[PDB]
Design a protein around this ligand. Sequence first.
Ligand SMILES: CNCc1cc(-c2cc3c(N[C@H](c4ccc5c(c4)S(=O)(=O)CCC5)C(C)C)ncnc3[nH]2)co1
Length: 167
Amino acid sequence: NSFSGYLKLTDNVYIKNADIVEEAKKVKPTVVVNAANVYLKHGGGVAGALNKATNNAMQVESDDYIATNGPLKVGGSCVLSGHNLAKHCLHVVGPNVNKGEDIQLLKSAYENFNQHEVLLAPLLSAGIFGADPIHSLRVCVDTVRTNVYLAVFDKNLYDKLVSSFLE
Ligand SMILES: CNCc1cc(-c2cc3c(N[C@H](c4ccc5c(c4)S(=O)(=O)CCC5)C(C)C)ncnc3[nH]2)co1
């Protein structure tokens, strides 16, 4: 958990302009959060990047989990191996508002982080999931009580988020 160069927003929420894959390699976190979908198909974006960094071992494990347990629910999660990126990967499904899912499920999605003491995570439901990233950060700060290090891989969005928080 050797997080470096983060800006502390509250006593338990930190943020950095960084690629979550590169952070996972530098930090060696106990838990890395994946921005998953309910069938754990890591086809692109954050999930595709984390799977590629494991040389597809995350996707094979994920397929075996789904075969035995069935899909997750939106707002839900599961704990699988972190492979070379962390001790564990917490796969969390935030709502995809571009696909009609309820933005209220973003609170349930962040609540899964409270089962782990320290996590490296992306900003849930942002990017092509369509939620307003300023709102996602607000839900994170209000919901997460354990220690969360957010990696946001876009300096333009990072600056807007820090300027929204410090208003
Ligand atoms: C350029 N080579 C591919 C690639 C991409 C990455 C890569 C992207 C990325 C990231 N993006 C942010 C984000 C946050 C959440 C969601 C998405 C996107 S999404 O994938 O569109 C849908 C699920 C939710 C974005 C708002 C700046 N944040 C952190 N670390 C990241 N790493 C490495 O390699």
